Amino acid sequence: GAMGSMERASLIQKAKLAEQAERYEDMAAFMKGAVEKGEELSNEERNLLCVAYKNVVGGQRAAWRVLSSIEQKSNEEGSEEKGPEVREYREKVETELQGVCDTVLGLLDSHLIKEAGDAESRVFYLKMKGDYYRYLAEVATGDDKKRIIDSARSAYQEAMDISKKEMPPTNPIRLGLALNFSVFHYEIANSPEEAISLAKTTFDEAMADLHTLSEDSYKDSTLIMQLLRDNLTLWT
């Protein structure tokens, strides 16, 4: 790998510089190099990995949705035949997106998840595995689409089981996992009732635990609780 000759600490330093410069592709390449050094990631370093790939794949998903919408309109009655170009370019963006997801899933499988023993790291990585299978599911249409969906579900479910056993209901990693698994139910699994039930139960059980928190922990937890409420407002 092109980052093999750079110090782990220098890769982390440059990931933070890339974030400041809004150079998220660079940030992801630096964090990929850091993971491939083979040492476990700290809490801060896990955040940097999350931020880098969230921004990269988020831009790809946004672009894929624009192109897919144009493609759908071109396949409407009375639409003028414009040739293969829209499908080709949507496929190009889709293929790059799948490549990014496969890269992230590869880092989690080699070997972030198997070395993560603490609940905070293990739930973080398993949620991430669910997320990037979810992005693969968003563009999937083939023989393995159901298996891609079930790979997302299985990763999310394992993260949920651990988070319920090992973390308080206000833990931001637990809350963020529930937020995203709820979105998986709504948008991927055709299960809006499960999506709404999960978001509501997660919100209510966090509300009841806020009294235990410091001001700074309260801020983190209520921030994600508001995202749960926002989704519930969208869905009801």
């Binding site: 963020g176 937020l179 979105v183 948008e187 994600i224 995202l227 926002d230 989704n231 969208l234 869905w235």
Partner: peptide, 5 residues
């Protein structure tokens, strides 16, 4: 789209 983190 709905919020995710």
């Amino acid at each position: 789209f709905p919020a995710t983190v």
